[PDB]
Amino acid sequence: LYFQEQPLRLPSPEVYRFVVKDSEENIVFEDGIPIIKGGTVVKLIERLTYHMYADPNFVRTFLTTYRSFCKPQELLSLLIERFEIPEPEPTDADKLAIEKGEQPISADLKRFRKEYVQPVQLRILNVFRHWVEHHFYDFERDLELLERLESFISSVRGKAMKKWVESIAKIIRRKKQAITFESPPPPIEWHISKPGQFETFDLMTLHPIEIARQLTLLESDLYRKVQPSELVGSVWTKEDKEINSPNLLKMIRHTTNLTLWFEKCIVEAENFEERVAVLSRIIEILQVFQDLNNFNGVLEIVSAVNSVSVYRLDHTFEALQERKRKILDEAVELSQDHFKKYLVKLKSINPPCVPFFGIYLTNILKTEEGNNDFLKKKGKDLINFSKRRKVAEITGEIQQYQNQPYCLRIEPDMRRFFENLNPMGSASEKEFTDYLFNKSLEIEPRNCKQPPRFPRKSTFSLKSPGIRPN
Ligand SMILES: CC(C)N1CCN(c2nc(Nc3ccc4[nH]ccc4c3)nc3c2CCCC3)CC1
Known part of the structure; x- marks a missing residue:
C-alpha cells in the first residue's frame, strides 16, 4: 500500500x-x-x-x-x-x-x-x-x-x-449414512371421525383445530426442506424441474391441491345451510392457522375464497355470522396492496411460523426477468454474477425461518389424508375449473334472491365443536 x-x-x-x-x-x-x-x-x-x-x-x-x-x-x-x-x-x-x-x-x-x-x-x-x-x-x-x-x-x-x-x-x-418435545404437546383433537377410521376423514368430520395443526405440521416440513438452489435461475419452471427442485415443487403442489380442495368443499356442498357451515368451518381453520403463525395456511384459504366459483356465492357469505366474516376479511386484507399488511406482520411474529411461500417465488421471477444472464462484451460475454447474488439475497430470507419446530404431535392417518388429497380426480385443471364454476352457477344461480333448495348431504349436526381445546 x-x-x-x-x-x-x-x-x-x-x-x-x-x-x-x-x-x-x-x-x-x-x-x-x-x-x-x-x-x-x-x-x-x-x-x-x-x-x-x-x-x-x-x-x-x-x-x-x-x-x-x-x-x-x-x-x-x-x-x-x-x-x-x-x-x-x-x-x-x-x-x-x-x-x-x-x-x-x-x-x-x-x-x-x-x-x-x-x-x-x-x-x-x-x-x-x-x-x-x-x-x-x-x-x-x-x-x-x-x-x-x-x-x-x-x-x-x-x-x-x-x-x-x-x-x-x-x-x-x-x-452417506443419513421427535423430542421440550414441553408436552397438547392432546390430539377429534370431532366426529375417530382414531383409525381414516376412510371417513373429511373437512366436517375431522376436528377444526387438528386440521389446522396437521396441515401446519405438514406445511412446516415442506417449507423446511426447500434448498436455495431450487429457486436460482427459475429452474423449477424449466426443463429438468423435477430433478433440480423436488422439495420446492412439493411445496407448490401441496398449496395447489389444498386450495382447490377448500374450493371443492364449498361448491360441492349444495344444501345452503350445509354450505354456510362448511365456509364457517374453513374460517375456524383459518383462525387456528393465525394462532399458529401459519400464514401459508392462512393465504391458501384466502386464495380459495377469492376463486371465481366461490367469490360469487353472495348468499353464502351474507349468511355468515358477523364475527367469522370479520376474521375472514382481516385475513383477506393481509394480501391487499402487494401484501403490505402481511409483510409487517411477518416481521413481528415469534417462531415457530410458516411464511407465505408465494411472495418469494413471485419476487424471484421478477429478478429473473429483470437481470440478464450475461454482460455484453466485444468477445466472449461474461457471466452476470451480481444477478445470482441478488437472487441469493432473497433465498437467504427463506432459510431464516426453517429451524423452528412446532410443539404439535403428528397424527399419521390425518397426515396421509392431506398428503393424498386429489380434488381434481380424473379431470384436468381446466376441466375441474369449469366444473366448479358450473356447480357454483347451479347452487346460487345468477340474480336469485333465495338460494335454491337442495337435499342435505349428511345426517350429523352442522354445529362446529369450535376452536377451544379441551
Ligand atoms: C357483493 C359482492 C362484492 N360479494 C359480497 C360477498 N363476498 C365477500 N364478502 C365478504 N364480506 C362481507 C360479507 C357479507 C357482508 N354483509 C355486509 C357486509 C359484508 C361483508 N368477504 C369476502 C367475500 C368474498 C371472499 C373474500 C372475503 C363476495 C363478494
Whole structure:
C-alpha cells in the first residue's frame, strides 16, 4: 500500500489459464474485499480460490447459485484444474544450482510455493468442504460426481493437507449414512371421525383445530426442506424441474391441491345451510392457522375464497355470522396492496411460523426477468454474477425461518389424508375449473334472491365443536 513489493513469479497462461491478466474483458467488479460483478467461469473459479485472502461470502453464494452457469461435473473439473499448478520454468542459473547439488531452491520458487500454491490448494479444499457440507444433494443425484471427488482427494499428497482430506471424508461419511418435545404437546383433537377410521376423514368430520395443526405440521416440513438452489435461475419452471427442485415443487403442489380442495368443499356442498357451515368451518381453520403463525395456511384459504366459483356465492357469505366474516376479511386484507399488511406482520411474529411461500417465488421471477444472464462484451460475454447474488439475497430470507419446530404431535392417518388429497380426480385443471364454476352457477344461480333448495348431504349436526381445546 505504501510500498510496492517484488512481484510474484507465476507460470505461463499457456499452461495454467488461471493466471491470465485481469481485465475488463474477463472480470468486472462493482464500483473489504471487492464485490464481483461478473466474469468468465475461469475467473470466477480463480477468485473463488484466490491466494491473497479468503472470501467466505463469495464461496457460499457461488455454491448456492453456480448451477445457473456451470455444471457440477464442470465445476469439479475446474477445481481440479486450479489445484494442479505447474511451477514457473526454472531459469538457467536455477538449473545450475540443482545440478551442483545441496543448494537451497531459488527465493522466487520458495515464494511461489508458500504464497501461491499452498494457499490456493487450501482454498480449493475449503470449497470441497463447503460443497459436501451444504450441497450434498449434488452427490446424491450424481454418483460419478462423488466418485471423482473421492478419487481426487485420495490423490492429494502432503502432511499439511491430510487434516483437510480427512475432514472432507468425515463429512461425506456423515452424509452417506443419513421427535423430542421440550414441553408436552397438547392432546390430539377429534370431532366426529375417530382414531383409525381414516376412510371417513373429511373437512366436517375431522376436528377444526387438528386440521389446522396437521396441515401446519405438514406445511412446516415442506417449507423446511426447500434448498436455495431450487429457486436460482427459475429452474423449477424449466426443463429438468423435477430433478433440480423436488422439495420446492412439493411445496407448490401441496398449496395447489389444498386450495382447490377448500374450493371443492364449498361448491360441492349444495344444501345452503350445509354450505354456510362448511365456509364457517374453513374460517375456524383459518383462525387456528393465525394462532399458529401459519400464514401459508392462512393465504391458501384466502386464495380459495377469492376463486371465481366461490367469490360469487353472495348468499353464502351474507349468511355468515358477523364475527367469522370479520376474521375472514382481516385475513383477506393481509394480501391487499402487494401484501403490505402481511409483510409487517411477518416481521413481528415469534417462531415457530410458516411464511407465505408465494411472495418469494413471485419476487424471484421478477429478478429473473429483470437481470440478464450475461454482460455484453466485444468477445466472449461474461457471466452476470451480481444477478445470482441478488437472487441469493432473497433465498437467504427463506432459510431464516426453517429451524423452528412446532410443539404439535403428528397424527399419521390425518397426515396421509392431506398428503393424498386429489380434488381434481380424473379431470384436468381446466376441466375441474369449469366444473366448479358450473356447480357454483347451479347452487346460487345468477340474480336469485333465495338460494335454491337442495337435499342435505349428511345426517350429523352442522354445529362446529369450535376452536377451544379441551
Ligand atoms: C357483493 C359482492 C362484492 N360479494 C359480497 C360477498 N363476498 C365477500 N364478502 C365478504 N364480506 C362481507 C360479507 C357479507 C357482508 N354483509 C355486509 C357486509 C359484508 C361483508 N368477504 C369476502 C367475500 C368474498 C371472499 C373474500 C372475503 C363476495 C363478494
